[PDB]
Amino acid sequence: DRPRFSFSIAAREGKARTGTIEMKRGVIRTPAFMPVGTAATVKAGADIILGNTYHLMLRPGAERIAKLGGLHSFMGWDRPILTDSGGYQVMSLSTKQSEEGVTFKHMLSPERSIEIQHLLGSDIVMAFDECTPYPATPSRAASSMERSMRWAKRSRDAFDSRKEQAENAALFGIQQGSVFENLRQQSADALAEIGFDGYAVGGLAVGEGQDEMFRVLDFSVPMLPDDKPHYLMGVGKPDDIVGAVERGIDMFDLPTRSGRNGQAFTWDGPINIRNARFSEDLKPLDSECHCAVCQKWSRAYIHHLIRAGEILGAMLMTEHNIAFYQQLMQKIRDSISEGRFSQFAQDFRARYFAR
Amino acid sequence: DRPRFSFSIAAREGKARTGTIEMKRGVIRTPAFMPVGTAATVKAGADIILGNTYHLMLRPGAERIAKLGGLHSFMGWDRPILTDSGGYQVMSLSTKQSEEGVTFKHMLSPERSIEIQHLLGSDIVMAFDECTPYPATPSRAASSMERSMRWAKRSRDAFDSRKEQAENAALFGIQQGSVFENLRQQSADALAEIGFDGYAVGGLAVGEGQDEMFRVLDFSVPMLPDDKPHYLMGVGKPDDIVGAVERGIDMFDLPTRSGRNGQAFTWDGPINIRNARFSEDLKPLDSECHCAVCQKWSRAYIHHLIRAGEILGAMLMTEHNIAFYQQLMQKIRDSISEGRFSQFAQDFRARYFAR
Numbered sequence: 001d002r003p004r005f006s007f008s009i010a011a012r013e014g015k016a017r018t019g020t021i022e023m024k025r026g027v028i029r030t031p032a033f034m035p036v037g038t039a040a041t042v043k044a045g046a047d048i049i050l051g052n053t054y055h056l057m058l059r060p061g062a063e064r065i066a067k068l069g070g071l072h073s074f075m076g077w078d079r080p081i082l083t084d085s086g087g088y089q090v091m092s093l094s095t096k097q098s099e100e101g102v103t104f105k106h107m108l109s110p111e112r113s114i115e116i117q118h119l120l121g122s123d124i125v126m127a128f129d130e131c132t133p134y135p136a137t138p139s140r141a142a143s144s145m146e147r148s149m150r151w152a153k154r155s156r157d158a159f160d161s162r163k164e165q166a167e168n169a170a171l172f173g174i175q176q177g178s179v180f181e182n183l184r185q186q187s188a189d190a191l192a193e194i195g196f197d198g199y200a201v202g203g204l205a206v207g208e209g210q211d212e213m214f215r216v217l218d219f220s221v222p223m224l225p226d227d228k229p230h231y232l233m234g235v236g237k238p239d240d241i242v243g244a245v246e247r248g249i250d251m252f253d254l255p256t257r258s259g260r261n262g263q264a265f266t267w268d269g270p271i272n273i274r275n276a277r278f279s280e281d282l283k284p285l286d287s288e289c290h291c292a293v294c295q296k297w298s299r300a301y302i303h304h305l306i307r308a309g310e311i312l313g314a315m316l317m318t319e320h321n322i323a324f325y326q327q328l329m330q331k332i333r334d335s336i337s338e339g340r341f342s343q344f345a346q347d348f349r350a351r352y353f354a355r
Numbered sequence: 356d357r358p359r360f361s362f363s364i365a366a367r368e369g370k371a372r373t374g375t376i377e378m379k380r381g382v383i384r385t386p387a388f389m390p391v392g393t394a395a396t397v398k399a400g401a402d403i404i405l406g407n408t409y410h411l412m413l414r415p416g417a418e419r420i421a422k423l424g425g426l427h428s429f430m431g432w433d434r435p436i437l438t439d440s441g442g443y444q445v446m447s448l449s450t451k452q453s454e455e456g457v458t459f460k461h462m463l464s465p466e467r468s469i470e471i472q473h474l475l476g477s478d479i480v481m482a483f484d485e486c487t488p489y490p491a492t493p494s495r496a497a498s499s500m501e502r503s504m505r506w507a508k509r510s511r512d513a514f515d516s517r518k519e520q521a522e523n524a525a526l527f528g529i530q531q532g533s534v535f536e537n538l539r540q541q542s543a544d545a546l547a548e549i550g551f552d553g554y555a556v557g558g559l560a561v562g563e564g565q566d567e568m569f570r571v572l573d574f575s576v577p578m579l580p581d582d583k584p585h586y587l588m589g590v591g592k593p594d595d596i597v598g599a600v601e602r603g604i605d606m607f608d609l610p611t612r613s614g615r616n617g618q619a620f621t622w623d624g625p626i627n628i629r630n631a632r633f634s635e636d637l638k639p640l641d642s643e644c645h646c647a648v649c650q651k652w653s654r655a656y657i658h659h660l661i662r663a664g665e666i667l668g669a670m671l672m673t674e675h676n677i678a679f680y681q682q683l684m685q686k687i688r689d690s691i692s693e694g695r696f697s698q699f700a701q702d703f704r705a706r707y708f709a710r
């Protein structure tokens with residue numbers, strides 16, 4: 001049987017890595033994109049899907065999901081599932097913060113977050129953190145990061161207390177520190193002292209823009225343990241993914257939101273399929289994409305469906321977008337393994353931004 | 356190669372018939388349900404799908420559909436397609452009527468309706484008729500039916516003038532006459548004198564209710580040629596279909612509308628999946644249904660998706676509903692062929708209405 005958790009790096013190019021995470025429910029090829037499980041009928045394709053902790057804890061509630069057999073049974077997905085810890089979502093969508101946790105309209109603490117994720121049955125559990133708002137002053141970023149590190153220890157202890165969770169799931173710690181190198185270093189040191197199965201870069205994709213995000217990744221990723229997976233939370237567009245892989249990121253969580261609003265991803269950049277220019281375009285959404293939508297239907301027909309208000313149009317767009325992202329990740333993995341990722345990144349950008 | 360059109364009756368029970376329509380693009384098993392082609396990725400499953408003449412003539416226009424290669428190429432469907440003549444839809448959704456045709460906000464005549472259906476490339480073409488409003492006085496029903504019969508002759512002549520259409524498609528005439536036996540007879544006589552490949556019962560499913568609809572079918576269907584298919588337009592719920600088959604109907608055009616509004620069809624009657632009673636129900640939508648949704652997911656999960664606003668929920672509901680209707684038609688065909696349709700209809704009603 002597969003181990004609870006084992007990350008192996010098969011090949012490297014610069015800071016980029018490709019490899020595998022083995023878990024009891026399956027193997028995850030990295031760099032990996034992790035789609036939302038409810039977006040479409042995701043097929044095994046993705047190696048791991050996201051569960052929506054924040055939504056599930058409100059409807060139907062984590063206790064009810066456990067009564068129904070856990071998220072794997074509920075969603076019909078027998079492979080790994082990753083869940084976020086819920087605080088990012090509470091702070092973005094719902095609040096009163098304290099050292100105990102976050103109260104909102106009802107108290108979410110590290111201990112409760114870990115128990116919710118246990119009741120959902122997820123395989124990769126995120127520590128309960130605070131995503132510091134951007135911009136943040138050095139003092140506020142430090143105080144926030146320090147609280148997150150105390151919460152990371154409480155998350156570790158709560159996870160270790162639940163035998164089924166400790167023996168079958170994995171726990172990731174989340175680095176904070178805003179855009180400040182010294183705080184990112186203190187956060188990395190604190191997380192490594194606690195010890196986690198993987199390490200996330202939190203506190204980005206919060207409005208800072210790509211140049212600043214890449215600058216922060218430049219110094220932040222090397223601070224994390226090299227032999228553990230690196231998960232960049234909340235990122236992102238295809239070009240953000242490529243640049244983050246170039247900086248040592250292994251896992252990523254737009255393709256669903258875009259698919260419901262008329263935006264399709266292609267190797268020549270995004271297109272808004274509702275635009276009249278596509279009304280007579282017989283080409284598939286993307287000229288090279290191998291997905292079932294591009295094998296069968298034209299831009300003109302998908303344009304027609306979406307303009308007519310047919311839900312089928314949005315579903316076909318979403319299926320194409322998820323498949324496009326998975327083809328992107330496969331090309332990334334293959335190019336790193338083959339030692340041609342630098343060339344791939346250059347070729348990708350030249351075509352994606354030529355439009 | 357298959358003929359342009361050939362209807363064969365394989366078995367009968369009372370007024371019910373089962374058989375096949377052969378056309379160049381495929382065989383249609385009857386009694387048949389014909390789903391909307393844009394509702395989901397319909398697989399061959401249905402033998403024939405509906406094209407939406409009224410929508411297509413406005414967006415992108417019939418000329419544009421022809422430029423794109425016709426509806427078969429546009430929709431990715433190589434089997435038969437049926438199109439309505441457009442007047443029902445103009446009168447229900449858009450008007451100024453005259454002997455020439457209907458002007459609306461732009462002139463739809465028998466000749467233009469036939470040419471639109473030619474440009475769309477459909478295989479079964481409906482004559483351009485007037486669906487008389489309900490209720491109608493005898494005088495108004497007569498005047499309306501008489502105009503429809505003049506329009507039926509003009510439709511016949513326009514269809515016969517287009518070589519590609521006359522040689523490769525089929526034309527159905529539409530009986531009118533409201534609820535009046537003498538007018539239904541005059542309409543049937545006029546249509547049979549013109550001569551059509553199939554005959555539709557029009558002017559029903561316009562608010563009259565099931566008892567009255569069945570009463571009209573009781574005398575109206577026997578007036579049509581026995582050796583030609585009988586298409587009841589606009590019907591209907593599963594129980595309407597069963598009772599109409601008992602009265603000699605072979606083809607039918609709710610499952611898509613219901614699927615987008617939370618209603619699922621089951622052998623125990625319809626259910627509204629959004630209701631809280633389904634939040635913990637681990638059974639599939641229907642206990643016997645063989646569709647892909649019922650093989651994989653529970654009522655509880657589909658309830659969750661729809662309540663969360665996920666388009667996936669509505670798509671799974673729609674796929675189940677279309678599959679349910681096709682299983683209904685298969686059971687109807689098998690039971691007629693086996694001489695147990697009367698028993699099937701009795702068993703169906705007892706369970707469907709017990710709920």
Ligand SMILES: COc1ccc(CCc2c3nc[nH]c3cc3c(=O)[nH]c(N)nc23)cc1
Pocket residue numbers: 036050051052053083084085086087088126129130131132174201202203204205206233234235253
């Ligand atoms: C549906 O499943 C999931 C959905 C979203 C996410 C990412 C959410 C997210 C951020 N998003 C942008 N920046 C973020 C930053 C963070 C962050 O700093 N911490 C946490 N815990 N989450 C963040 C993870 C899983």
Ligand SMILES: COc1ccc(CCc2c3nc[nH]c3cc3c(=O)[nH]c(N)nc23)cc1
Pocket residue numbers: 391405406407408438439440441442443481484485486487529556557558559560561588589590608
């Ligand atoms: C999308 O493709 C299609 C959609 C709807 C229909 C049926 C429309 C319809 C009626 N509906 C209820 N009563 C009707 C009655 C009629 C009728 O009397 N005549 C015509 N031409 N149509 C009718 C046919 C094809």
Ligand SMILES: [Zn+2]
Pocket residue numbers: 285286289290291292293294295320323324
């Ligand atoms: Zn595609």
Ligand SMILES: [Zn+2]
Pocket residue numbers: 640641644645646647648649650675678679
């Ligand atoms: Zn089903």
